[PDB]
Amino acid sequence: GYSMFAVGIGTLLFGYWSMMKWNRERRRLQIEDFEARIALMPLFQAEKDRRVLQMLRENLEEEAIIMKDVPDWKVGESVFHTTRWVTPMMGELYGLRTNEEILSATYGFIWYT
Amino acid sequence: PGIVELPTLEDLKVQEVKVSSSVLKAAAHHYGAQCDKPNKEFMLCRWEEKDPRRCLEEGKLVNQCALDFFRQIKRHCAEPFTEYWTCIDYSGLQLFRHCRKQQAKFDECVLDKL
Amino acid sequence: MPLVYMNIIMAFAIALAGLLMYRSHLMSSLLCLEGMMLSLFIMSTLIILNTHFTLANMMPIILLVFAACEAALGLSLLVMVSNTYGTDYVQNLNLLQC
Amino acid sequence: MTMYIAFILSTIFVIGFVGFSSKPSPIYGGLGLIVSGGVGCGIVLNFGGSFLGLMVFLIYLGGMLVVFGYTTAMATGDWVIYDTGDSGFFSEEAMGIAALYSYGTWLVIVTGWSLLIGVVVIMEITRGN
Amino acid sequence: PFFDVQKRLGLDLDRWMTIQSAEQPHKIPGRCHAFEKEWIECAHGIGGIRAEKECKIEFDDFVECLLRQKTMKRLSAIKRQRDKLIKEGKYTPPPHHLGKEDPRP
Amino acid sequence: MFMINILSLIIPILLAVAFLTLVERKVLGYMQLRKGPNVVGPYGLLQPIADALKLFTKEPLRPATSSISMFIIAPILALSLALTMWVPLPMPYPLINMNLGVLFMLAMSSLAVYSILWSGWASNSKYALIGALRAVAQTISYEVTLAIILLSVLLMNGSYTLSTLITTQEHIWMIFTSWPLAMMWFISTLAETNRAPFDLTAGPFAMFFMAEYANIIMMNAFTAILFLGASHDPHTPELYTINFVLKTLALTITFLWIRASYPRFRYDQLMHLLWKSFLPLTLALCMWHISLPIMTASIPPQS
Amino acid sequence: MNIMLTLLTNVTLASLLVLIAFWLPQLNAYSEKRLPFSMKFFLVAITFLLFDLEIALLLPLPWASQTNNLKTMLTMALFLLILLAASLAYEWTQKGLEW
Amino acid sequence: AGRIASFLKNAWAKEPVLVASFAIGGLAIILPSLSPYTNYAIRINRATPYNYPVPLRDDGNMPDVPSHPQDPQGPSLEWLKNL
Amino acid sequence: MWFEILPGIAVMAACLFIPGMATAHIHKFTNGGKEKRVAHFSYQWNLMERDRRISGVNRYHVTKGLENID
Amino acid sequence: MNPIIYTTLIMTVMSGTMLVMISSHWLLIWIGFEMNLLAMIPVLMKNFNPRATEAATKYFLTQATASMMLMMAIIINLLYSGQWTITKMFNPVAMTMMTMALAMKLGLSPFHFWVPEVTQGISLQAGLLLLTWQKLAPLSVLCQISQSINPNLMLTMAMLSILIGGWGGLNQTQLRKIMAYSSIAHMGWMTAVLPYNTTMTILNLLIYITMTLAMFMLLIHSSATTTLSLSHTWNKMPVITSLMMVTLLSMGGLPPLSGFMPKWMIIQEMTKNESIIMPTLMAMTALLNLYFYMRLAYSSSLTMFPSTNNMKMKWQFEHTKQMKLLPTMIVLSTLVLPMTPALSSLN
Ligand SMILES: CCCCCCCCCCCCCCCCC[C@@H](O)O[C@H](CO[C@H](O)CCCCCCCCCCCCCCC)COP(=O)(O)OCC[N+](C)(C)C
Ligand SMILES: CCCCCCCCCCCCCCCCC[C@@H](O)O[C@H](CO[C@H](O)CCCCCCCCCCCCCCC)COP(=O)(O)OCC[N+](C)(C)C
Ligand SMILES: CCCCCCCC/C=C\CCCCCCCC(=O)O[C@H](COC(=O)CCCCCCC/C=C/CCCCCCCC)COP(=O)(O)OCCN
Ligand SMILES: CCCCCCCC/C=C\CCCCCCCC(=O)O[C@H](COC(=O)CCCCCCC/C=C/CCCCCCCC)COP(=O)(O)OCCN
């Protein structure tokens, strides 16, 4: 009776110790991966800013071409009273683009399995 | 109310870094250690200005610095780096744990050369 | 205000009308209440996720919990009514009157 | 674009609500309620809230509507409101929901007390006498 | 009516969830953090009536950030005019909007 | 090449649940000092084909007075859930990789009782309705403990992802970390799928039988992945596939062995067993497994 | 999209197999010739519902473990589980679990 | 003392499941406040970088803030490595 | 004797061998001989999109190495 | 039920009301309402019988519908302005729906139908708790957002409530239905001054609570439910009938009794805002409440109805249980007019 309980508790303790060591190693590996991402971040941020600005500029050029005949339209008019920079919506960038990349941008991460 | 100002497409032209994500991850640590100053300047400017249009020069600087770093790597340690990033690329999660051996070879090579 | 929110409020209004119509079968009344609750959950989830109001992600779950509790309570009452009458027709609850 | 898939799902949600709102044969109204709940979970999952959608699909359908059916048997335009940036190396919804234990101490306390009182109330009501 | 026990005891039972810009986990920002911050700072210690009358610009910007009704109206107008022009045949989309562009990282 | 993957995941499962009947008959026969089917075909290999042909050529006994709608809906739902509950499973790469795989499995398992409820309601008999009510009550009662044990075990994994379960058990099986939870989980899976000692109870009948056996194999594969991890070498997944299949087959043989070696519980006896022996222990062990990583500073990584 | 395709394939295959099994024997012509309402079942259903709600509250624990407020999170989780145990105990002692 | 021991002996018979459950629950409640590794767990959770560390603007009066990641100033994760 | 149960079991083993490796092989054939890239947490998805845009073939598995740095 | 369980349920009801009153979050207020509703049901069903069950299910249905409407209003308000704090509603539709939800919770007409039946089905003790305690949370919520409520909707609902209470009180014979209609009329009086001065609302609430507590305790003391059972009381405890008649005169608004303090004061406030027709209408309507109170007083104390022989045996036994605070309630509900200015305490 005592022997069975002792064997069970010993197995539990051995498993706990092994899992402790392995989980600490996993924590260290996760920190290493996060540090790699942190090191790589600024280049991605710069590229994202450049891409967003280019998309906005192309949309502005197309708006200037199209809205030429509308009487009261002001090309590139902000809808906010403030002059602070405002992050554009998905529709502000992909409004005039083809439909497949619209779907990719709006739904790719959710639909990727 | 007002007109938004956007930089011309000639202001957004820069030599892009045309390497894939696995290649970037392979040399992420050395890139962070060596190219730290332009990256930190750009990121501080980004967090202080709160405006993408006020930080174009720092973006061009960080692109140029990354290109210089990769040119040095290509000049000196092309082959060990190629093996290392190939191994990193094969895995689905791109784990550093898979091939510590190639990483050790690349680290010792780049410590010997540069 | 996009069409998704309009459709969700329309669903809530339809469920409320169904609850207030009261043909018979008090179980149908409880079902209408829980349809209204489900519409509330969907609308709140969409609103909270759209604006990235992170700390508000707790709100739907909590809501659901409480509402489900009420449903349980309601069911209990329904059971007792049947145990007194043999069936759950709404028209049987006419002992009390104004 | 997928013929306004969010709009399709919303319209199917409304159709199911109309179907079960007429209250025909409460078991059939229940079936309409499961259909509507599945459509709503689809909407939530499509939007991006995976955990909350699975939460609906588990709790609501599996437990609560199942208890409803048990008791019944015992008796006789889009895609433009979205974001631009990324969530980082985590899911924002999961972090916000898991913040229930570190931030929402008051919510946890009141909800637990309410559930315990609900147990007591159910026992008292169904005791009979 | 409203017995402000919290402010008397400084407990903060339920004030952390009231607004978007109040100590989110991992410092995840709200979608309209800046506008809400601006409106809150405009209307603090001013009173309800004066805040409604005087800080209307900030609240209008905040509501525009939340719902984006005006942006939707503008985009819909642009899309409708573009569709009309492409129906008449006086406008042709550039390669960038046809998928033939050169993508950038 | 995605529909090919779906078909190559669906058809082999159906063939496996076809031959599981033959394997079960052979195992029970040899445990009962006899032989199983060994006349039809070389070693009974053609028995499932004969059984399927006989079932599909036999007239159905439609009540002609019940609700045909739910009567035909229930097998659809049962088989659909049984087939769709296989896609999150990583062997070793899941067909559909989902962040919240375990919650999805739990949700489908919870939905599985609608087939029982609707079949009982549409049977148009008070005795069948009573049997369906008892089955539903037992299933939901045991699924409560299933969910609690599942979250308590996953507390050491880091997240609800199924693939991460391979990484967590890279050095040691999870059977050693928590065996009591594993035994209670095994009994809960036995009681959930209506198997001895918990089995109180043409076309649609075969549909239900296939759904039940597919659920058996799914539960056993899930237990093998969750508690008995296999080494995974990224450059050769065949080793992991072989190990996982062998462990699943061992657990299925254990299911048949348990059915053949024990009497059956009463309804009230099994309800007492759950509500007064599993649930208190489940709560205590869940508290222990909440507190353990904080005690030992071994919190799993992913978040 | 992939999961939608998988679900559609599963449902379509199941429906096709069910209908062919239902109609294959139908081509060949043949002869072609309450009150009780036990309360215990309802009580167990309600108990399951309430425990399901408490499990729904408990579910976000795997992500709740990384907060830097380990003491508060641990206290709250143990409080929730203690309330669950207390509810079960109250149901037990007042003969709420009898057949 | 004697009555409590007698009651525990009685409960260990004819009701072992409840005794085991209560013992495990009590241990799980009590032990974390005594274990010395819980602070280590808190520190490990604190040391995981989830967000980008935004650099501070230098003003000449920040000796504790390193100017480069390699610099000796700043928090160190050697204690984690030794674990 | 007892080993006569082995054939049928073997068949089940084969019927359980088919799915797993099949997926693996498909996951290689569609992804250029490498493991399928998993994308949780919405950061790896941005990486996959960046590789897709970089490759110039509109496939993420086409990896542009150091030779593209000029 | 067990006394401990009853005490726990009462504590839970009070805790829900306290949570509603002391919270600054819409979600927490909704949680408090749900807790109140959840714990309030068994109090109605303490004495099990079909009437109690039917009343409890009517109450549950009405309260659940009101709570769902309140949550929908909160959702719309959050949608049109990302604010959870209980303040200006920032939306007309949300304010309208929340006003209907709080009207359903309170019992204002035309959502008044459930009050007489729920009061009639359930016991005197349950009724006393339901009539006075329940009003505190919805009234606090209405006071917190009085600057946003539309005066037209609140004023027309208050006028309709006064009319309906006055008219319906005339017909009823059972005392519990008379109390239900009296509560409806008093709440019509009390919610009419919300847009102008919430202090008058609180003062009227306190005075009404004192009066109805005194009257319900008197009805419990002399165990009478119908009018004739009350008429029999004079033969045993004439003092109870006299005190009840004085309290009834107070509840009708007769000066110099305490019940005149709210109405008068309320009228004064609506005269400061150039509202003259409405206070006159509500006064002439409260005349009906006065009429049926006077009829009850005629039946109870001012005349001696025929008695019964068995009542002789009741002369020999005394009331074993005495309820404390009854004399205080009577005094506070009858003789506190000269201390009217104390309402400046912002009670
Ligand atoms: C103070 C009055 C006491 C007597 C009156 C009691 C009235 C009813 C009882 C309920 C009130 C209890 C007050 C609890 C309020 C919670 C907030 C406070 O406690 O601070 C918390 C401290 O947490 C404590 O651990 C709370 C533990 C209390 C819960 C255990 C027992 C609760 C029982 C209450 C009754 C429930 C039913 C009965 C159970 C027996 C926050 O911790 P902290 O880390 O700084 O902040 C984290 C947020 N960050 C990230 C922004 C920093
Ligand atoms: C019959 C008339 C009603 C009598 C009511 C019963 C009398 C006994 C009550 C015992 C004392 C009551 C309160 C206990 C004192 C401590 C509580 C104190 O801290 O509360 C303060 C407040 O004190 C109370 O409000 C005053 C209570 C006095 C009530 C009597 C006024 C009745 C006027 C007409 C009758 C004249 C008196 C007759 C004899 C009593 C805090 O105020 P504050 O939190 O900042 O504002 C909240 C209100 N807001 C939200 C609207 C702004
Ligand atoms: C230092 C800190 C350590 C932390 C503490 C941790 C140690 C915990 C020690 C105790 C844990 C043991 C828990 C095990 C589960 C208990 C279940 C139980 O007790 O129930 C049984 C009943 O259980 C059964 O009988 C179920 C039988 C079902 C048939 C299955 C037969 C079992 C054989 C199959 C082998 C099991 C395979 C397990 C491995 C699975 C691999 C995945 C008792 O019921 P009764 O006899 O009626 O008594 C109650 C009235 N006095
Ligand atoms: C403070 C920690 C609490 C949290 C941990 C536990 C969480 C979950 C466990 C509890 C779940 C609910 C328990 C409900 C209790 C009901 C008690 C009861 O009524 O049962 C009695 C019987 O139970 C008892 O005998 C009384 C309680 C039994 C013992 C209780 C605990 C004893 C002491 C525990 C600690 C042991 C000492 C520590 C040793 C440490 C190691 C050296 C009736 O028996 P029946 O099953 O109804 O009859 C069937 C047969 N005809």
Tab-separated table of N, CA and C in Angstrom, chain A residues 19-74:
chain	number	residue	atom	x	y	z
A	19	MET	N	10.041	18.673	-16.352
A	19	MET	CA	9.249	19.719	-16.985
A	19	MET	C	9.728	21.101	-16.572
A	20	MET	N	10.172	21.255	-15.325
A	20	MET	CA	10.731	22.530	-14.889
A	20	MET	C	11.925	22.920	-15.747
A	21	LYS	N	12.877	21.999	-15.901
A	21	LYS	CA	14.063	22.308	-16.697
A	21	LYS	C	13.692	22.628	-18.141
A	22	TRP	N	12.828	21.805	-18.739
A	22	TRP	CA	12.483	22.012	-20.141
A	22	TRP	C	11.731	23.322	-20.345
A	23	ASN	N	10.838	23.677	-19.420
A	23	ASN	CA	10.082	24.913	-19.562
A	23	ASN	C	10.978	26.132	-19.393
A	24	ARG	N	11.964	26.061	-18.496
A	24	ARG	CA	12.916	27.166	-18.397
A	24	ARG	C	13.716	27.320	-19.688
A	25	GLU	N	14.139	26.200	-20.281
A	25	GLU	CA	14.832	26.283	-21.564
A	25	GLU	C	13.939	26.898	-22.636
A	26	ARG	N	12.657	26.533	-22.640
A	26	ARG	CA	11.727	27.112	-23.604
A	26	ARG	C	11.574	28.612	-23.392
A	27	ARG	N	11.552	29.054	-22.132
A	27	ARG	CA	11.509	30.485	-21.846
A	27	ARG	C	12.716	31.193	-22.444
A	28	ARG	N	13.905	30.613	-22.263
A	28	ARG	CA	15.109	31.235	-22.810
A	28	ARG	C	15.057	31.308	-24.333
A	29	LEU	N	14.601	30.233	-24.981
A	29	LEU	CA	14.498	30.243	-26.438
A	29	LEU	C	13.499	31.290	-26.917
A	30	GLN	N	12.379	31.430	-26.207
A	30	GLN	CA	11.394	32.444	-26.568
A	30	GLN	C	11.979	33.843	-26.444
A	31	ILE	N	12.762	34.087	-25.390
A	31	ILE	CA	13.402	35.392	-25.241
A	31	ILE	C	14.364	35.649	-26.394
A	32	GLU	N	15.121	34.627	-26.796
A	32	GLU	CA	16.038	34.788	-27.923
A	32	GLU	C	15.288	35.149	-29.201
A	33	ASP	N	14.177	34.458	-29.465
A	33	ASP	CA	13.395	34.751	-30.664
A	33	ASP	C	12.822	36.164	-30.623
A	34	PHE	N	12.325	36.582	-29.457
A	34	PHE	CA	11.788	37.930	-29.326
A	34	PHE	C	12.873	38.976	-29.541
A	35	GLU	N	14.092	38.701	-29.073
A	35	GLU	CA	15.187	39.640	-29.295
A	35	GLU	C	15.553	39.727	-30.769
A	36	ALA	N	15.510	38.601	-31.481
A	36	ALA	CA	15.739	38.656	-32.922
A	36	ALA	C	14.692	39.525	-33.610
A	37	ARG	N	13.425	39.364	-33.223
A	37	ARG	CA	12.373	40.200	-33.795
A	37	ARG	C	12.592	41.674	-33.467
A	38	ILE	N	13.006	41.968	-32.233
A	38	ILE	CA	13.262	43.349	-31.832
A	38	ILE	C	14.385	43.946	-32.666
A	39	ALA	N	15.448	43.176	-32.892
A	39	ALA	CA	16.546	43.662	-33.719
A	39	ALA	C	16.084	43.932	-35.143
A	40	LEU	N	15.193	43.093	-35.666
A	40	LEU	CA	14.747	43.258	-37.044
A	40	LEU	C	13.656	44.310	-37.217
A	41	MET	N	13.040	44.778	-36.131
A	41	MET	CA	11.873	45.654	-36.250
A	41	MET	C	12.098	46.941	-37.040
A	42	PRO	N	13.136	47.752	-36.777
A	42	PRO	CA	13.179	49.091	-37.400
A	42	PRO	C	13.136	49.083	-38.917
A	43	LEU	N	13.792	48.115	-39.556
A	43	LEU	CA	13.735	48.030	-41.010
A	43	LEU	C	12.309	47.792	-41.489
A	44	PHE	N	11.585	46.897	-40.815
A	44	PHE	CA	10.194	46.646	-41.171
A	44	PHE	C	9.346	47.894	-40.978
A	45	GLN	N	9.586	48.636	-39.895
A	45	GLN	CA	8.828	49.863	-39.669
A	45	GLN	C	9.071	50.876	-40.780
A	46	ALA	N	10.332	51.048	-41.181
A	46	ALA	CA	10.645	51.990	-42.251
A	46	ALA	C	9.976	51.580	-43.557
A	47	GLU	N	10.057	50.291	-43.898
A	47	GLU	CA	9.441	49.824	-45.135
A	47	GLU	C	7.929	50.000	-45.099
A	48	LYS	N	7.307	49.739	-43.948
A	48	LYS	CA	5.864	49.915	-43.825
A	48	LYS	C	5.469	51.371	-44.019
A	49	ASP	N	6.216	52.290	-43.403
A	49	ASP	CA	5.914	53.708	-43.576
A	49	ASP	C	6.032	54.115	-45.037
A	50	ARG	N	7.096	53.667	-45.706
A	50	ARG	CA	7.280	54.018	-47.108
A	50	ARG	C	6.148	53.472	-47.969
A	51	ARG	N	5.749	52.218	-47.734
A	51	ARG	CA	4.681	51.621	-48.530
A	51	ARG	C	3.357	52.339	-48.311
A	52	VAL	N	3.042	52.674	-47.058
A	52	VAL	CA	1.793	53.375	-46.771
A	52	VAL	C	1.777	54.731	-47.460
A	53	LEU	N	2.888	55.467	-47.378
A	53	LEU	CA	2.938	56.782	-48.009
A	53	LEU	C	2.812	56.676	-49.523
A	54	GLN	N	3.443	55.666	-50.127
A	54	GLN	CA	3.330	55.500	-51.573
A	54	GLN	C	1.903	55.169	-51.989
A	55	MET	N	1.230	54.290	-51.242
A	55	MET	CA	-0.161	53.979	-51.560
A	55	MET	C	-1.036	55.220	-51.450
A	56	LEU	N	-0.827	56.021	-50.402
A	56	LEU	CA	-1.601	57.248	-50.250
A	56	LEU	C	-1.341	58.211	-51.400
A	57	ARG	N	-0.083	58.331	-51.830
A	57	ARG	CA	0.233	59.230	-52.935
A	57	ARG	C	-0.416	58.771	-54.234
A	58	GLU	N	-0.387	57.465	-54.510
A	58	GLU	CA	-1.036	56.963	-55.718
A	58	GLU	C	-2.538	57.211	-55.678
A	59	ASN	N	-3.161	56.978	-54.521
A	59	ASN	CA	-4.588	57.250	-54.395
A	59	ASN	C	-4.883	58.730	-54.594
A	60	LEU	N	-4.003	59.603	-54.099
A	60	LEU	CA	-4.196	61.037	-54.295
A	60	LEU	C	-4.088	61.420	-55.765
A	61	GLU	N	-3.126	60.839	-56.485
A	61	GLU	CA	-3.010	61.117	-57.915
A	61	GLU	C	-4.261	60.674	-58.662
A	62	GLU	N	-4.760	59.475	-58.354
A	62	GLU	CA	-5.973	59.004	-59.015
A	62	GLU	C	-7.170	59.878	-58.668
A	63	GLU	N	-7.265	60.319	-57.413
A	63	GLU	CA	-8.348	61.214	-57.029
A	63	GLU	C	-8.265	62.528	-57.789
A	64	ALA	N	-7.056	63.067	-57.946
A	64	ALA	CA	-6.896	64.307	-58.697
A	64	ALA	C	-7.314	64.124	-60.148
A	65	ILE	N	-6.996	62.970	-60.734
A	65	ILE	CA	-7.383	62.720	-62.121
A	65	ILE	C	-8.900	62.595	-62.245
A	66	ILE	N	-9.533	61.873	-61.318
A	66	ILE	CA	-10.953	61.561	-61.467
A	66	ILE	C	-11.829	62.751	-61.090
A	67	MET	N	-11.550	63.395	-59.958
A	67	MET	CA	-12.393	64.449	-59.412
A	67	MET	C	-12.271	65.767	-60.167
A	68	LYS	N	-11.611	65.775	-61.328
A	68	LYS	CA	-11.350	67.026	-62.031
A	68	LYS	C	-12.638	67.734	-62.433
A	69	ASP	N	-13.695	66.980	-62.727
A	69	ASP	CA	-14.935	67.561	-63.219
A	69	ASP	C	-15.950	67.860	-62.125
A	70	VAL	N	-15.819	67.253	-60.953
A	70	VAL	CA	-16.758	67.534	-59.861
A	70	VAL	C	-16.570	68.976	-59.403
A	71	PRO	N	-17.634	69.781	-59.335
A	71	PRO	CA	-17.465	71.228	-59.134
A	71	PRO	C	-16.828	71.623	-57.808
A	72	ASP	N	-17.418	71.192	-56.698
A	72	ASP	CA	-17.025	71.672	-55.379
A	72	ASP	C	-15.992	70.790	-54.694
A	73	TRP	N	-15.478	69.770	-55.372
A	73	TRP	CA	-14.544	68.854	-54.736
A	73	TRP	C	-13.188	69.511	-54.518
A	74	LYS	N	-12.644	69.335	-53.318
A	74	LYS	CA	-11.284	69.742	-52.991
A	74	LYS	C	-10.426	68.487	-52.934
